[PDB]
Write a protein that binds this ligand. Structure first.
Ligand SMILES: *[C@@H]1O[C@H](CO)[C@@H](O)[C@H](O)[C@H]1NC(C)=O
Lengths: 257, 10, 27
């Protein structure tokens, strides 16, 4: 997360860390959507141009975390994966279309002050909130700046980072990039004329873009950090998987499994 | 970099 | 699912986090 701030304790209790067993590595973020199901980006698990194809046994989900690096004894919970489900029409070529995956945990996780699921939107919540100018919130332990030889200082945060970012109109998203965008994506971030900063960055993928509903006081996950070009660049926006657009696949997987 | 997690996980 | 999206340390305590109101103001 670039130009965000440290999360408060329990501020994002649905945040999940996808953690590699060997070597130890932050692979991606993710989100808790029930006591046994975790949502993430497909490319966190499968991305052939980078020789990435993980199995269930290669990774762990760590829930309730704040520190990036500590083992937060009696605070975080570590869960093993029973099965990964990648969207059957995920397209890693091209433009990461339908960049979404589910992971079923081997055992249900107990909820706590630090661990609690986020809601998925229904059609009214998505129509009410997914509108240009409305801000959502992105969280992660990914890079604090676009990687660059000229950077000075620590590149990864001590604790979970948070940034609030406005949704951008689809034609502006489209025209900002030569990468082909689709209706399975939306973009967010400040426009040049707003003179502000903030973005997701490498290492944040899979984490949630959430919005608060004034209709019922609940937080909803509208997006998944998916891709961008650099981080916090002038004239660019971050791109997010559109969760509501892919919700029927989510529901199919959870109802079948 | 990361603190060791319990070896039961792994 | 029934209790989703309500945080123990915020909504369940009627407490706001420090930037939540920024979101509401945009909406
Ligand atoms: C990913 O690896 C699994 C075995 O873990 C295999 O079934 C699948 O064909 C591989 N997919 C790609 C695109 O490499």
């Amino acid at each position: 997360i670039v130009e965000g701030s440290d999360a408060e304790i329990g501020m994002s209790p649905w945040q999940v860390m996808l953690f590699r067993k060997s070597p130890q590595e932050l692979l991606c973020g993710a989100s808790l959507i029930s006591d046994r199901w975790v949502l993430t980006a497909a490319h966190c698990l499968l991305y052939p141009p980078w020789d990435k194809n993980f199995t269930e046994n290669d990774l762990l989900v760590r829930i309730g975390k704040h520190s990036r690096t500590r083992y937060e004894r009696n605070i975080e919970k570590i869960s093993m994966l029973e099965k990964i489900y990648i969207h059957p029409r995920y397209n890693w070529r091209e433009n990461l279309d339908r960049d979404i995956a589910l992971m079923k945990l081997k055992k249900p996780v107990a909820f706590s002050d630090y661990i609690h699921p986020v809601c998925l939107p229904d059609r009214e919540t998505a129509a009410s909130l997914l509108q240009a100018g409305y801000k959502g919130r992105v969280t992660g332990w990914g890079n604090l700046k676009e990687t660059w030889t000229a950077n000075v200082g620590k590149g990864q945060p001590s604790v979970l980072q948070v940034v609030n970012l406005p949704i951008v109109e689809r034609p502006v998203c489209k025209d900002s990039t030569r990468i082909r965008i689709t209706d399975n994506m939306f973009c967010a971030g400040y426009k040049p004329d707003e003179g502000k900063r903030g973005d997701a960055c490498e290492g944040d993928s899979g984490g949630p873009f959430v919005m608060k509903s004034p209709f019922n006081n609940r937080w909803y996950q509208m997006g998944i950090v998916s891709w961008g070009e650099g981080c916090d660049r002038d004239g660019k926006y971050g791109f997010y998987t559109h969760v509501f657009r892919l919700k029927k696949w989510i529901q199919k997987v959870i109802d079948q499994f | 970099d990361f603190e060791e997690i319990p070896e039961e996980y792994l | 699912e029934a209790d989703c999206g309500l945080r123990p340390l915020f909504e369940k305590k009627s407490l706001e986090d420090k930037t939540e109101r920024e979101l509401l103001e945009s909406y």
